[PDB]
């Protein structure tokens, strides 16, 4: 078939005394090595290199009387959302921040409440009359919700806050383009 003998012939430079010399015996070797890197990478490299990290964040937790058996269950209880490789980065470069975490999980602080579902506003039920001019009652509140969340994010000096300085006037930016 196709031995990939083109690619695997440049590699014969970095082999020992026999595979480097003779082209045949080098291929059976370099194609045996390359076929086991890809065999170890996709199969066994994870379960090993994934436990040298759960040993480093753990060993860095014993210096605070806790351990991975307890830390793992309470990094999640608090919704902290830290990859187990990140906790090893902190335990090794930012030792205080890690410790600061380890104090939180041990503290009796209420974890953040589970995210809420979709709540129907009251105004969805509130019977609308036959009025065409004014907007629906639910949009005048939902839109207000969107512009407050629009100004709370960041400290955008919207032209040093040249846009309407207050909200009830920002919802009237449609009258700015009327004559």
């Amino acid at each position: 078939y196709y031995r990939a003998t083109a690619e695997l012939d440049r590699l014969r430079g970095m082999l020992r005394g026999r595979a480097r010399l003779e082209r045949k015996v080098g291929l059976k070797r370099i194609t045996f090595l390359m076929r086991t890197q890809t065999r170890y990478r996709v199969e066994q490299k994870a379960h090993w290199e994934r436990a040298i990290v759960r040993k480093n964040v753990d060993s860095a937790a014993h210096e605070h009387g806790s351990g991975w058996q307890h830390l793992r269950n309470d990094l999640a209880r608090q919704n902290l959302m830290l990859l187990p490789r990140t906790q090893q980065q902190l335990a090794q470069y930012e030792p205080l921040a890690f410790r600061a975490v380890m104090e939180l999980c041990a503290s009796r602080v209420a974890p953040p409440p589970p995210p809420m579902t979709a709540q129907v506003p009251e105004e969805a039920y509130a019977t609308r009359p036959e009025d065409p001019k004014v907007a629906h009652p639910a949009a005048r509140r939902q839109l207000e919700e969107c512009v407050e969340r629009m100004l709370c994010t960041g400290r955008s000096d919207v032209l040093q806050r040249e846009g309407p300085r207050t909200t009830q006037a920002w919802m009237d930016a449609w009258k700015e383009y009327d004559l």
């Binding site: 066994q44 436990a51 040298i52 060993s59 351990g67 991975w68 058996q69």
Partner: peptide, 18 residues
């Protein structure tokens, strides 16, 4: 458990006493 040959990957130590 995961290539039953033998498991030499570093295991976690039990938790210190409270």
């Amino acid at each position: 458990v995961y290539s039953s040959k033998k498991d030499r990957t570093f295991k976690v130590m039990p938790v210190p006493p409270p």
